[model samples]
Target: STGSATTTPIDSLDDAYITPVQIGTPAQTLNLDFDTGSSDLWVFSSETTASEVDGQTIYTPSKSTTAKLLSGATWSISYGDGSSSSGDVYTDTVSVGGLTVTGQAVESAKKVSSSFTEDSTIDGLLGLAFSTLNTVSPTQQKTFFDNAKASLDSPVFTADLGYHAPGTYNFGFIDTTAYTGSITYTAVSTKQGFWEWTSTGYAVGSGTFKSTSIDGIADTGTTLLYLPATVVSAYWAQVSGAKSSSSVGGYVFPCSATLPSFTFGVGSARIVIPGDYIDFGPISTGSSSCFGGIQSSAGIGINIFGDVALKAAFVVFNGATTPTLGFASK
Candidate 1:
């Protein structure tokens, strides 16, 4: 069967997308960030200390008759941005859109970092990464997608992330109206628990497309596109007055500077990212300086094709044999 959900921007923080999910017997609906970069479905819950809980909504397992504790099982996770959370485990009926997964592992957080506690908008995260990345102790937990896939007509999902508008996340089937042109497919290497792929090359502005192999993962959880330091430098070189800033962090340029379009090669298909998308808004609310959405992935090790890049195209995360990624213009 098929299921779909509407995704909305997280208030003024247009960096991420949030979708509603129902958990437990009575169904406690929570707005969760659907993350493709991680593999643990965790939520801030009644177990959290009152001091740690600010304006965020908490999921109370005790209120649900279907919730059952997994004896001695616990989970902890640390994100690339240094945000963290730890909690005990429970098996409950979790549903997304109209699809339900019985006995899905739901991590109830007892402790959350300031980053999460302060961000009152999001209630939790729904991991879409491979199950191998799960962090539960004793036995690794299966993701909501993983548990629901077996019963799906097709083990696939499509992420249509929008810039400032609402997008749709469709599961079990593809929506032809969501994208245009033929969907170009690429082989994905999930060895690192990500939808990793290598682009044939890239180009700056209307320049020639250089044929350099670039390895990276398409991460929905990350806010910016991170590439090799050299590649990032090359892109900025085309924009006058753009420079790498130690204080501002990453590359920044005058908001009025003329920017160049970025194009990535996926086999014979080329996905072009408009220049406006590269200028990821101002450094701050009233600042004239704007940060380049594309930055150096130097210390991060793995290059990330984050939301900035993903929003420009419709992406398909296929879970069939040899798991692959499909892209098309939105």
Candidate 2:
């Protein structure tokens, strides 16, 4: 059997994507961010402080007949964006699409930062990263995909992310109709608890491929693409009014600039991200300066191929013993 779900962008900016997950016996459906960058399945809950519980949905353990407290277990996690949450644990029946996994560790938030409270559209996060990244203490727990993988016909799941459009995630088997051409498989190094892999090379628009190797993680949770400074600067050099602005905290350009497309290689497969995709919305509502989806990773320590790159192609996060990632064009 397999699981499938419709993932839609939370807003016009495509800041993040959210999907519905049914938790508990009565099936309390909550909109959750499908994050491939982290491994804690936490949610705003009845345990959350009232001040931290703004407009997001909360999971009430007592209201669920199947929910059971995981005694002596607690977890805390922080994100690169600085938003964070910490909570006690509970094991409950969680369902994604039509696939159900019992005894799934559900972290009930007791505290959250203002960034989370401010984002009303995201009720929680469904982490798809490796189980090693989970924050649960004393006893680490497997991710929803890991728990459900055994029951699945196969040990792979595919992600088809879209820009300003609804995407699809399918578990167990790859959807042949979702993408065009053959899928290119690559080695995935989860040493850092992420779907990190290497890209063969990159090119700005129709420029020459330099045969440079780049290592980065496919982080669906992040909004922008962060590459090495050399690659990032090379891509931006083609744009007329682009600059690394300290005020905006990233590379920004005049809203009217003619941006060039960016392309990265995955095992000889070149995935092209349209120029328009790089032009993130304006810094201010009425301002002329626009943020870029691709930025320098010099300070980030690690390069990140965020939604800006993922949404450009079809990706498969294979959970086999060896763990491999597959990429294809759509």
Candidate 3:
């Protein structure tokens, strides 16, 4: 493995983040979500009938020969939003990036409920997020990062999410170029089923904007950034003529106008989001687009900074040294 400046191509893992390896064999590349809220590396299997799912990648153990299944170890997971899936336990040689650890265990879901089937595009979620909900007992529970940390060339792992095009997420050495300046890391609080952090405030258009103490969590599994409606509306009010357009739903705004710039204050460090990143997807009923960065998810109980917010920043999850999050730029 090369140091900081080298670019070596390991197997591709798509947006799932971590790669997978099969047991007793060479590393079998599989996508992982790297979620800190859960601790399971789940992948689809070719044994799943075609009628069982829409388009997605399936992992076939028969092809690997070295794969082993734990008899009577069937499992099921239920989410807070009424989503769930059932599967069996299997041991494989799961590979993340180029680092392969043998005898790694993963879940192979055979029956998924409708809630999971709705988002049919996703093959399966490889939850790397830390969670108490694990099949293995406390004595045996181990995460991919926990297993691969010593072997990984770099002490840190970085996620470089693409904004428009497909972005690059690498393991091993940290890409120093991803950050515009220096990185400021914060201690991780592994409570309440997520890796939450403390944020100072926000900055809109070069001005310091502080709101009442708000709680923020960095969640890799979620796709959108959920913020307080009042906070989002107040931030949007600063943009000149930055009226909410119903064309592309409420959160989206038109791209033609000179949009506003926003930044998130995380401790002493600041992360900026340009105006263009504000352009969200188009609404079916309206012609105008929604703002990409901020949205209304008030009363959702928890405010989550999902993949969209993460794409603009280079984040490092320091699971090796201490459970901390380091934010930089790309």
Candidate 4:
């Protein structure tokens, strides 16, 4: 059966998004980050070290009568910021929207990185990327999406990210009414365990399309759009006061400056990212210098088409016999 759930942005900057998920018996609900960049469903747990477990909702597997230990199994995963988590595993009933899986593998955190502890609202992380990236050892595990794919009315899911509002995730089907224009489809590469694809090109407001490939992944977990410095510099150059600041780490501009829109090609379609999306937020507490949402991916190894670009349109993750990605105007 098809099901959908709404996800809300945790901060005004829309830095992270959260969706409610039901886990264990009797349905213990937790708000989780539905990440597409990685494949490990991990949570803060009763076993997590106390000092690292500040104000957080911990998953107590013992409380769930239906929970079963996957004895001797362990897992670990790293994030983009060097933050990480590792823990023992359990099999329990899990549900997102109205879709349910009876024996979903849930990793409970025993240890966490400092950055994970600092983020207060994140109770867990529900990864939706390719299961090839799952880190569970003894045996690798399938993601919630993979396990639930067969029972779904369709094998596709869609993400409708909001700029400063609640987003929605529809599993098994695309809601035709949610978008304005026809969806433009593109091939996806799972070799890197991601929703990786190559964009036809990019353009800075009113500028001509670069006519080159910009390969990247659609990562809901990531906060910024990291492109090659050449393209990033090109976009920032259009703003009057934009410049790279050593103190701020990336490009920053005067708060009052007019920001130019960024457009990227998908097939023959051009999707535009609003200027407000590019003007991410202030460098510090109410500073005049605003930090940028699009940063240079130099040394990071790959370009990331994260939330900064995703919030601009509707995205579809088609998990058919041959997987593909779709984008539409909203």
Candidate 5:
């Protein structure tokens, strides 16, 4: 797994950004999703039907000399958002941040149906969370990190969100300007996968939160925040006396008054999710629906905190080299 170091050019142009990586003697670029829940790398290909896929950057093998597809294996991924995709597997030289590694296994989705393609900003997802979620078989499970871990200068991996536009999401480095001096690393439960935590509670417009705890997961692949019911009811209570909507999957809120800012604190790191993000495009679905910061999960076991929450602090993931996660500013 030892290899030479290299840099990948990350482009944030026209919604679909591109990250260039060296793939052996030839260079290839792959799309990445700043995901925290799972670790995997997938891309769209020319064989991908344009009508079936949208918003994702498609890679044409004709443009690269090192692209080859795996025959006879089925690959598919289904997301909680009711989106799904299926395709074959492939292996080629892969590189990132100027680091070159050979024979990196990558998933090529032939069929994609998610807001990911329609969002027009994301073409594919570069999962950086862990290797457990990869769709590849046992024989081809290891991709970039599996091969590069030993050669990695450090055991830690840090993602700098919006560092480019949405912020440059980078790996293996920390930016001091984003946070204080140190990061608050939470002890992750082993059952949830890699590192996972639950939310003590959430608030809206500075409302007094209920004293109930909720199980939650942090994911960057998702675009919005998802929470449980008690937190949503407590949050909406202070937002112009609004109520929750059973129709919109618990995201829409009333737009009569300017919603107050909400704060989510994880130990010492407190992140404030602005009202604008709550109202988002000001899409109202009910008469008394003020954007519910926390929605009713109906007691579901999982509550996902997407990029809106992750951007608040610098998150570090170490591949057990140090035995624990090392947190720093990004």
Candidate 6:
């Protein structure tokens, strides 16, 4: 059945959005981060070591009459942000919004990194990336979106991440009223199991838009906008007191510095990111030093259009034939 869901952002974190999902026979509800960068539907469960779980809810498969363990199957994933999780696998009925999938692989976390354990709000990750990226051993698993796509009116989902506000993750449909202006479509390459696309060029402030090609991925799980070293340098150069801070990592500037607007070309449409959004708040809680949201993606081979970038526009993750991305001003 075709359905949609409203996604909410964690108060101060602003790192990722969470949606409610039900798993098992009687339906155990869990808050999951719909991650596009990786695949694997993993959750903190009774199997997790006591020390590994802190303040987070745990899923108990034995309590669910429909849950069945996939013997010997396991999953582990490491993210670019140094977050990681691993666990055993279980096949159960999982439902999102109003759509349900039978025999969905539900990974139960047995181990997790500090990045995950410290986040008390996140129960697990709901991977929306291609099925090819699933980490289930011996046999890979399909994402909820993949299994529900055939029954949908359209093979697409929209990510409307907010900037200190509530946004929605609409499945199987597009709500025209949610966005303004025309939606510009771009071709995406799923070669690496990401919503990867190329930007024709970019501009700083009111500067001329150049004609250099840059490749990157649209990652909802990421917090900042990562670009090529040269691109990051160019943008930071325009700010009077901007400097790369090794201590804080990436570029940092005076909190009072006047920032420049950034724009990237997606076909004929130019998506602009306001300057205020670039200033990713103070480096530390009470510090006067602010960090630049756009940083170097050098170590990471591919650039990333994180929340800082995605929130500036309405994004469509089109799963229809030849996967495409559509962007429009919010």
Candidate 2 C-alpha lDDT tens digits along 162-246:
8889999888999999989989999999899999999998999889987988999999899999999999999989988889999
Per-residue alpha-carbon lDDT of candidate 1 for residues 1-330, written as tens digits (9 for 90 to 100): 678999998854367899999999899999999999999999989998778888888889999999999989999999999999999999999998998999999999999999999988889999999999999999999998889888888999989988878898888998889888879999999899999999888898999988989999989999889999988999999999899999988999999987899998888888888888787778989988998989999989999999888888899999996899999987
TM-scores for every predicted model: 0.97, 0.99, 0.80, 0.98, 0.78, 0.96
Write down the RMSD of all candidates, one decimal each.
Answer: 1.2, 0.8, 4.7, 0.9, 4.8, 1.3
lDDT of each prediction vs. the true structure? 0.90, 0.92, 0.62, 0.92, 0.56, 0.89
The predicted structure with the larger TM-score, 1 or 3, is 1
For residues 106-176, could you state the per-residue lDDT of candidate 6 as single tens digits? 99999999988988889999988889999999888899888888988899988988787878888888889
On a 0 to 1 TM-score scale, where does candidate 1 land against the true structure? Answer: 0.97
Show model 3 residue runs off by greater than 4 Å.
1-37, 79-83, 113-121, 135-140, 153-155, 239-258, 289-292
Candidate 3, residue 143: lDDT: 65
Off by over 4 Å in 2: none
- Superposition error at 275 for model 4 (Å): 0.2
lDDT-superior candidate, 1 or 6:
1
Worst 10 residues of 6 by lDDT: 6-15
Q: What TM-score should be assigned to candidate 4?
A: 0.98
Task: Residues 262-291, candidate 4: write the lDDT tens digits.
Answer: 999999998999888887778899799999
Model 1 C-alpha RMSD vs. true structure (Å) is 1.2
Q: How close is candidate 2 to the true structure, as a TM-score?
A: 0.99
Pairs that collide in candidate 1 are none
lDDT of 3 by residue, 135-226 (tens): 54323345666566677776566766666555555566777776778778887777764667776677767676674555777876665567
